[PDB]
Design a protein around this ligand. Structure first.
Ligand SMILES: [Cl-]
Ligand SMILES: [Cl-]
Ligand SMILES: [Cl-]
Ligand SMILES: [Cl-]
Ligand SMILES: [Cl-]
Ligand SMILES: [Cl-]
Ligand SMILES: [Cl-]
Ligand SMILES: [Cl-]
Ligand SMILES: [Cl-]
Ligand SMILES: [Cl-]
Ligand SMILES: [Cl-]
Ligand SMILES: [Cl-]
Ligand SMILES: [Cl-]
Ligand SMILES: [Cl-]
Ligand SMILES: [Cl-]
Ligand SMILES: [Cl-]
Ligand SMILES: [Cl-]
Ligand SMILES: [Cl-]
Ligand SMILES: [Cl-]
Ligand SMILES: [Cl-]
Lengths: 143, 143, 143, 143
């Protein structure tokens, strides 16, 4: 449909790979966080620097379900795509897919995050404009 | 009935902690992998050096589900526990819990791994002794 | 002078920073390796995938001297610049500077790497065209 | 003369090892930091949780020099040793050696750290008891 997707690419690097030149799974999760960071800065107008600084806020992960479909290797460029599954006042759920350079699905992950005060930890609502911006990404078929 | 639970501890270190003031979630996954590594070396008699070396094998992750219950902080010692959920010929599913120093649950991850040939990638059966050792960790109540 | 420099930029991310939102030093070294990887792929026509794959080669570090001049923080974009200090048949020495968005020097590192066979470790000469390409980056004032 | 050397061990893990088949060098620096962390907690009575917490302090690195002597591999246990080179009021320089299981030198790093106020960055003197504890590790022969 026309609900939004957020997309970008990531190069599989030497730092990401095991002795076989295949991606070590915790490293996918560094890739995933970088992608969420990007989405916040580019699409939601609430970059992590502002959020964790002046904002005294965070978006820690509550739940994460990841399926590793096919391996990725040193030197491949992967494409990352994000949709929003569910959006509350404080919590939000995204679905992220990583696809290889010939369009093969590499991993699919559904991730629930919660907006919190970091001084000290306690849930809080998302900023209104942020929640409004996320609403455009919502794919009602996903949940 | 009779069973076994594999358990050890890990210190939350500076390298693990982020600008929200807690453990950065990919870092939990490095701690998870370290724990699985420990299990293989210390309980299953199939250390990763041997497995990935002469063994020409690995145990890549097929599926992860992680529930983050409460945050962890610099300087805390966490307890890690492993139980086996399901055991096939090649695939195996484990449940790992991380607990805080007063036993508060921090995270629970259900993870399916698959034994593979690394030369080159293709599923293969676990060694007989290894599967037999893993069977002792089976938690029937999780089935 | 007109000897060459290799340049690119890198965003300081959440994964790079400590609890204060300042870069944790081992993370600079992940940034440094990524930059060398880039230089090999873009400038030297010998990407890490080809090098570690078909090439059965590596460029492990022999020596590294790094001065941390000023701290870097979450959300800053740093500029990375590389020059070649010294070039042998197998060994090569680079100097890398990271500068902040307002041109302040953040870190300066002189790094000696050695071309090796990875099956199994043993020095070898650089490929001729690679060594030729590095020669253009040589700043004879540096050593 | 009378002195002390701080020493402990570390296992080389899957997470540390790369596509050249050895420890990936930034990973040595995470192991270095862990070791300094250990020194502070176990020898100097100033653990990082306390230091960075109530203490509003840190010990960022100003200078690194690392000589990589021989590679390390998955499954090896390394020995880490610390000696103090130089001790000022705020700054301190340490020499750390990593050795293999048959005592072969793997790397030697000379590192200068500086005690700082984190609220906000500005050098400050080490606590008196901490400096006194560090003095016991001084290796006059390295001066
Ligand atoms: Cl590609
Ligand atoms: Cl909510
Ligand atoms: Cl939600
Ligand atoms: Cl593909
Ligand atoms: Cl029984
Ligand atoms: Cl199976
Ligand atoms: Cl299974
Ligand atoms: Cl607890
Ligand atoms: Cl067998
Ligand atoms: Cl049971
Ligand atoms: Cl900037
Ligand atoms: Cl040479
Ligand atoms: Cl050289
Ligand atoms: Cl600057
Ligand atoms: Cl004496
Ligand atoms: Cl001083
Ligand atoms: Cl000093
Ligand atoms: Cl040795
Ligand atoms: Cl004092
Ligand atoms: Cl002495």
């Amino acid at each position: 449909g026309m609900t939004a997707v957020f997309r970008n690419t990531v190069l599989v690097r030497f730092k990401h790979c095991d002795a076989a030149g295949i991606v070590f799974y915790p490293r996918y999760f560094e890739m995933l966080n970088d992608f969420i960071e990007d989405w916040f800065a580019q699409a939601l107008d609430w970059p992590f620097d502002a959020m964790h600084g002046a904002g005294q806020a965070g978006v820690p992960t509550a739940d994460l379900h990841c399926r590793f479909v096919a391996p990725s290797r040193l030197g491949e460029t992967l494409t990352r795509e994000l949709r929003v599954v569910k959006l509350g006042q404080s919590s939000f759920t995204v679905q992220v897919r990583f696809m290889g350079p010939d369009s093969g699905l590499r991993l699919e992950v559904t991730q629930r995050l919660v907006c919190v005060d970091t001084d000290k930890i306690a849930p809080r609502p998302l900023p209104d404009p942020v929640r409004q911006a996320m609403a455009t990404y919502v794919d009602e078929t996903l949940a």
